[PDB]
Amino acid sequence: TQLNFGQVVADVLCEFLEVAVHLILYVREVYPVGIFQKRKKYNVPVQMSCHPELNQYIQDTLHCVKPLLEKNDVEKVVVVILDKEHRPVEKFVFEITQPISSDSLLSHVEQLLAAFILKISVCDAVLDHNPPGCTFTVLVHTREAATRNMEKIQVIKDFPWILADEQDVHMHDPRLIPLKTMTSDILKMQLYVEERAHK
Amino acid sequence: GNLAGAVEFNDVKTLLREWITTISDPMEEDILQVVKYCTDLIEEKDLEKLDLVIKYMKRLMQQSVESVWNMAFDFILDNVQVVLQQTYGSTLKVT
C-alpha cells in the first residue's frame, strides 16, 4: 500500500518468489505431496512446504536476493530442476525489468501476480513429465558483473554464494514455454520455462 | 582449475603478474573470474595451489599504491574464506 523506498518493490517480489518457488516444487513433484498444505495467496489456492529446513533454504535464498532487487541489479531469478545425475532438465525463469510513491497501485500488481501463480498451478499441461529423482537449485542472473553484487548477497551466515559453473547453467536443445508477461510502471516481469529436448 | 585459459600454475602467475602491474582500474569481471578460479581450487581439493595464488596476489596487490588493488585482494580473500569456512570449517591462515 504505502511508505518505504524501492523496498516494497523488493518485499513484493520476494514474497511472490517464496510462493512461486514453493508451488513449482509442488507442481513438478520435486518433493513428495506429503510435505505440503493448501493455502491462499493473491486470493488464489497455492501450496507451501511446512518441512522447516526446506522452508529455511528458500527463505535464506531470497533474503540474500532482497538487497540486489532493492537497487534493481537482477536480470533474472531462475529455478533450475536438475535430474538425479545433476543435469539441468527444466528452468523456471523470472525475467525482471527496471522501469513516484505507490498508494493502492501496489494492490494492482498483487493482482497481476495472481495470473503467474495460476499459470504455475496448471503448467503440467504445457511441459513434458519430469524424470524422477530431480532436485532443484536457484541461479540469479545480475544485469552486469559487479563485486558490489557478491558483497550485497553474502549477508546470511552459513549460507555463502558462488559464481555458477557452466555445468550449472547449460541445457542442450532447450525449448521455450512462456507462461506470463506483465507490464506495470513499477514491474515488468516475464515467467518462461526452458525445457530439455528429452528427459 | 582454469583461470582465463591458464591450467598450469606458472602460467596462472604469468597472468596475475601481467594483469595487476600493467592495468590501473581492473575490470570487475576479471576480479570475479579470479574468485571463481579460487573457489574452484577448493572444490578440486588443491589447498596448496590456493595458498600459493593467495600469497602471490597478496604481494603485488598490497604492494600497489592504488587502493583499487588493496581492496580487490580484500574482496577476493573475503570470498575465498566464506567458502573455506563452509566446506572445511576453517579459514586460510594468511601470514
Binding site: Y57, T135, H141, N149, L163, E166, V169 | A4
Partner: peptide, 21 residues
C-alpha cells in the same frame, strides 16, 4: 567468461533427507 550468474554453495535438502520424517 560468465561472471554475472550467482548460486548458493549449499544445496536444498534432498528428497531422501525429507523422505525420513
Amino acid at each position: 567468461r560468465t561472471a554475472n550468474i550467482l548460486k548458493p554453495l549449499m544445496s536444498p535438502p534432498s528428497r531422501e533427507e525429507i523422505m525420513a520424517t
